[PDB]
Design an enzyme around this catalytic site. Structure first.
Site, mmCIF file in Angstrom:
data_model
loop_
_atom_site.group_PDB
_atom_site.id
_atom_site.type_symbol
_atom_site.label_atom_id
_atom_site.label_comp_id
_atom_site.label_asym_id
_atom_site.label_seq_id
_atom_site.Cartn_x
_atom_site.Cartn_y
_atom_site.Cartn_z
ATOM 1 C CE1 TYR A 157 -3.908 2.203 0.806
ATOM 2 C CE2 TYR A 157 -2.642 3.042 2.705
ATOM 3 C CZ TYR A 157 -3.762 3.134 1.840
ATOM 4 O OH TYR A 157 -4.737 4.144 2.004
ATOM 5 C CB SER A 158 3.347 2.250 2.551
ATOM 6 O OG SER A 158 4.491 3.074 2.596
HETATM 7 N N1 LIG Z 1 -10.606 4.628 5.030
HETATM 8 C C1 LIG Z 1 -9.450 5.065 5.527
HETATM 9 O O1 LIG Z 1 -9.156 4.983 6.714
HETATM 10 C C2 LIG Z 1 -8.442 5.646 4.547
HETATM 11 C C3 LIG Z 1 -8.695 5.707 3.182
HETATM 12 N N2 LIG Z 1 -7.709 6.267 2.329
HETATM 13 C C4 LIG Z 1 -7.911 6.289 0.850
HETATM 14 O O2 LIG Z 1 -9.268 6.405 0.696
HETATM 15 C C5 LIG Z 1 -9.597 5.865 -0.598
HETATM 16 C C6 LIG Z 1 -10.919 5.136 -0.302
HETATM 17 O O3 LIG Z 1 -10.716 4.288 0.856
HETATM 18 P P1 LIG Z 1 -11.949 3.551 1.541
HETATM 19 O O4 LIG Z 1 -13.191 4.199 1.063
HETATM 20 O O5 LIG Z 1 -11.700 3.366 2.952
HETATM 21 O O6 LIG Z 1 -11.828 2.174 0.825
HETATM 22 P P2 LIG Z 1 -13.046 1.255 0.526
HETATM 23 O O7 LIG Z 1 -12.455 -0.114 0.543
HETATM 24 O O8 LIG Z 1 -14.193 1.576 1.374
HETATM 25 O O9 LIG Z 1 -13.498 1.666 -0.890
HETATM 26 C C7 LIG Z 1 -12.889 0.877 -1.886
HETATM 27 C C8 LIG Z 1 -13.454 1.216 -3.283
HETATM 28 O O10 LIG Z 1 -12.558 0.912 -4.454
HETATM 29 C C9 LIG Z 1 -13.143 -0.231 -5.172
HETATM 30 N N3 LIG Z 1 -12.225 -1.178 -5.683
HETATM 31 C C10 LIG Z 1 -11.535 -2.125 -5.077
HETATM 32 N N4 LIG Z 1 -10.785 -2.791 -5.978
HETATM 33 C C11 LIG Z 1 -11.000 -2.229 -7.156
HETATM 34 C C12 LIG Z 1 -10.548 -2.453 -8.448
HETATM 35 N N5 LIG Z 1 -9.672 -3.392 -8.672
HETATM 36 N N6 LIG Z 1 -10.992 -1.727 -9.487
HETATM 37 C C13 LIG Z 1 -11.869 -0.756 -9.240
HETATM 38 N N7 LIG Z 1 -12.328 -0.474 -8.018
HETATM 39 C C14 LIG Z 1 -11.908 -1.204 -6.964
HETATM 40 C C15 LIG Z 1 -14.236 -0.818 -4.305
HETATM 41 O O11 LIG Z 1 -15.291 -1.165 -5.205
HETATM 42 P P3 LIG Z 1 -15.387 -2.647 -5.765
HETATM 43 O O12 LIG Z 1 -14.929 -3.636 -4.618
HETATM 44 O O13 LIG Z 1 -16.986 -2.862 -6.029
HETATM 45 O O14 LIG Z 1 -14.594 -2.751 -7.007
HETATM 46 C C16 LIG Z 1 -14.718 0.397 -3.511
HETATM 47 O O15 LIG Z 1 -15.536 1.220 -4.348
HETATM 48 C C17 LIG Z 1 -8.422 4.933 -0.972
HETATM 49 O O16 LIG Z 1 -7.609 5.515 -2.003
HETATM 50 C C18 LIG Z 1 -7.637 4.872 0.295
HETATM 51 O O17 LIG Z 1 -6.248 4.638 -0.062
HETATM 52 C C19 LIG Z 1 -6.483 6.753 2.849
HETATM 53 C C20 LIG Z 1 -6.263 6.671 4.222
HETATM 54 C C21 LIG Z 1 -7.227 6.102 5.058
HETATM 55 C C1 LIG Z 2 -1.634 1.424 9.007
HETATM 56 C C2 LIG Z 2 -2.186 2.526 8.112
HETATM 57 C C3 LIG Z 2 -2.851 3.598 8.944
HETATM 58 C C4 LIG Z 2 -3.759 4.456 8.090
HETATM 59 C C5 LIG Z 2 -4.497 5.420 9.018
HETATM 60 S S1 LIG Z 2 -4.879 3.328 7.233
HETATM 61 C C6 LIG Z 2 -4.478 3.831 5.655
HETATM 62 N N1 LIG Z 2 -5.042 3.320 4.560
HETATM 63 C C7 LIG Z 2 -6.000 2.222 4.668
HETATM 64 C C8 LIG Z 2 -5.129 0.990 4.367
HETATM 65 C C9 LIG Z 2 -5.517 -0.241 5.197
HETATM 66 C C10 LIG Z 2 -6.404 -1.166 4.344
HETATM 67 C C11 LIG Z 2 -7.858 -0.956 4.721
HETATM 68 C C12 LIG Z 2 -8.477 0.172 3.900
HETATM 69 C C13 LIG Z 2 -7.429 0.927 3.090
HETATM 70 C C14 LIG Z 2 -7.150 2.319 3.677
HETATM 71 N N2 LIG Z 2 -3.570 4.815 5.636
HETATM 72 C C15 LIG Z 2 -3.121 5.195 6.848
HETATM 73 O O1 LIG Z 2 -2.273 6.081 6.902
#
Ligand SMILES: NC(=O)C1=CN([C@@H]2O[C@H](COP(=O)(O)OP(=O)(O)OC[C@H]3O[C@@H](n4cnc5c(N)ncnc54)[C@H](OP(=O)(O)O)[C@@H]3O)[C@@H](O)[C@H]2O)C=CC1
Ligand SMILES: CCC[C@]1(C)SC(NC2CCCCCCC2)=NC1=O
Ligand SMILES: NC(=O)C1=CN([C@@H]2O[C@H](COP(=O)(O)OP(=O)(O)OC[C@H]3O[C@@H](n4cnc5c(N)ncnc54)[C@H](OP(=O)(O)O)[C@@H]3O)[C@@H](O)[C@H]2O)C=CC1
Ligand SMILES: CCC[C@]1(C)SC(NC2CCCCCCC2)=NC1=O
Lengths: 255, 258
Positions: A157-158
């Site tokens: 991820y990172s």
């Molecule tokens: N939630 C958090 O704590 C944090 C979130 N973020 C960033 O927020 C953004 C959204 O995160 P969050 O809403 O929590 O994640 P979710 O897992 O809730 O949302 C994931 C979304 O992306 C889709 N997805 C997964 N795989 C694919 C694929 N291969 N092709 C197209 N779509 C895909 C899923 O739809 P589907 O499975 O139907 O394809 C879903 O719509 C991300 O970029 C994440 O890195 C950053 C830091 C923290």
């Molecule tokens: C240890 C990560 C801490 C955190 C706050 S969590 C994050 N991304 C998430 C990655 C974990 C997978 C589950 C959903 C994806 C969004 N980024 C961050 O800095």
């Protein structure tokens, strides 16, 4: 920020079926934007489009598919384009599914993380650029703390997230001198309410979780104001501590 | 706790991208300290001409293996069929990069992908492949990066993304290894402008800074992996060293370390 700003606006939101992506959909729909949403999960997308429609979307559309597939990604923007009347703003938000584990030797997941959270973002950006240059539009790229600082358990991820900062923060300096009037906003997020994050940090993290509906809007706001970056975390120390001002200076000198 | 050329004598050290620039010099210094050394790079006789020069300086063992780190298999295997040549692996120095010129980014996804594959993925692949051996040696991974790897630069977008990626992955791993009491060190090297042929010409009439000497640079890199440091900063500007360190990041990593 004025929401009148998104009035007649053409916005793509990827990763738009659940989490922070959906909420943007809805905010964008409330502000009566035009929205095309994407993910793999068809049956979920029907549900958000119709919710968007209910909410006041100027129009709403889905196109379902997977961003491991670069030709789908490139094809996704052209159709998204043709459905609305062009494109004003492109919000890359999707990520390959991930969870917290030590990294052992899972090289397929390091690759998938790179392709889906990073490469697909480039492919979508290349395809989306003509239309964005015609509206002086915006790229919104959703990243995270772990794309600014190192955290264990989210290595793959990172790596994809640092890559996002590297590549786009560099494209943006290029744009600047290229008279390329497309803005580029990097969103740095801490933990957010979302179902998939809450389930993934299952007692592994004792970090206060931020409202997803609010984070959603912060992302729009930021991109709409053509802001280079958006920091959004519940903790106070983080928001302070996360900014790198010597990066800013260091960049001027080297400039 | 000082640096002694004595430190690197029993040591089976892989160097990658050693057929020229920094990589070559790194394998020269290593041999001057009497280590077994295997080097890879695509081109074959340039490598012969390095293995050979490597004895004149007083190695212990010098071989080479040609292949393109574009191919994950070669990478998987190169490491395998190289610890087999030295007995174990003790240090892995990862520094090869796919040719990048310096141009504005237009639509070259090809170049982006190749850049991630070669400049980042291969390092992961080779780390994986090298680990059993290193875990055992108590080895020292050393990833060569760049200013562009810590800070944004126009012209090098795809290159920059691959360096920024090495940091976010290898710093995480560092953190995991630390908690797993896995006793392998990981050294991230942030290099400024170095007077290699590739750089010299890649950057002629464009990047107007001093050109830190190649042969000095490579020793600093080694001293670094030798001492098990987290990072080494080699650039020829005082500003640079002074600004590039990021104490907020280290604190943020601490706070969260609990
Ligand atoms: N939630 C958090 O704590 C944090 C979130 N973020 C960033 O927020 C953004 C959204 O995160 P969050 O809403 O929590 O994640 P979710 O897992 O809730 O949302 C994931 C979304 O992306 C889709 N997805 C997964 N795989 C694919 C694929 N291969 N092709 C197209 N779509 C895909 C899923 O739809 P589907 O499975 O139907 O394809 C879903 O719509 C991300 O970029 C994440 O890195 C950053 C830091 C923290
Ligand atoms: C240890 C990560 C801490 C955190 C706050 S969590 C994050 N991304 C998430 C990655 C974990 C997978 C589950 C959903 C994806 C969004 N980024 C961050 O800095
Ligand atoms: N020089 C500078 O100023 C800076 C250098 N760096 C970093 O320093 C490290 C070395 O750079 P430098 O020595 O200047 O560059 P060089 O061009 O001299 O080194 C390239 C090395 O990579 C090998 N190589 C190229 N392509 C491949 C491939 N596809 N598979 C395997 N090997 C390959 C080459 O051998 P072959 O082509 O025969 O395959 C050669 O030995 C890099 O990581 C670079 O990022 C960072 C900042 C600045
Ligand atoms: C604008 C680049 C600023 C520079 C000092 S040069 C660099 N890496 C080099 C990339 C150039 C391609 C050919 C040589 C390879 C190594 N990293 C930096 O921070």
């Amino acid at each position: 920020f004025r929401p009148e700003m998104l009035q007649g606006k053409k916005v793509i939101v990827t990763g738009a079926s659940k989490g922070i992506g959906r909420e943007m959909a809805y905010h964008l729909a409330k502000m009566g934007a035009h929205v095309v949403v994407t993910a793999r999960s068809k049956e979920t997308l029907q549900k958000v489009v119709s919710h968007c429609l209910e909410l006041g979307a100027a129009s709403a559309h889905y196109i379902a598919g997977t961003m491991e597939d670069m030709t789908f990604a490139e094809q996704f923007v052209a159709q998204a384009g043709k459905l609305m009347g062009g494109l004003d703003m492109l919000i890359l938000n999707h990520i390959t599914n991930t969870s917290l584990n030590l990294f052992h030797d899972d090289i397929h997941h390091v690759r998938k993380s790179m392709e889906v959270n990073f490469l697909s973002y480039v492919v979508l950006t290349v395809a989306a650029l003509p239309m964005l240059k015609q509206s002086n539009g915006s790229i919104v790229v959703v990243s995270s703390l772990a794309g600014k600082v190192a955290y264990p358990m989210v290595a793959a991820y990172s790596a994809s997230k640092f890559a996002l900062d590297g590549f786009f923060s560099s494209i943006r300096k290029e744009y600047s001198v290229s008279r390329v009037n497309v803005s580029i906003t990097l969103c740095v997020l801490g933990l957010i309410d979302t179902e998939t994050a809450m389930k993934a940090v299952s007692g592994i993290v004792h970090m206060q979780a931020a409202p997803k509906e609010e984070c959603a809007l912060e992302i729009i706001k930021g991109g709409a104001l053509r802001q280079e970056e958006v920091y959004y975390d519940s903790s106070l120390w983080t928001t302070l501590l996360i900014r790198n001002p010597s990066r800013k200076i260091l960049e001027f000198l080297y400039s």
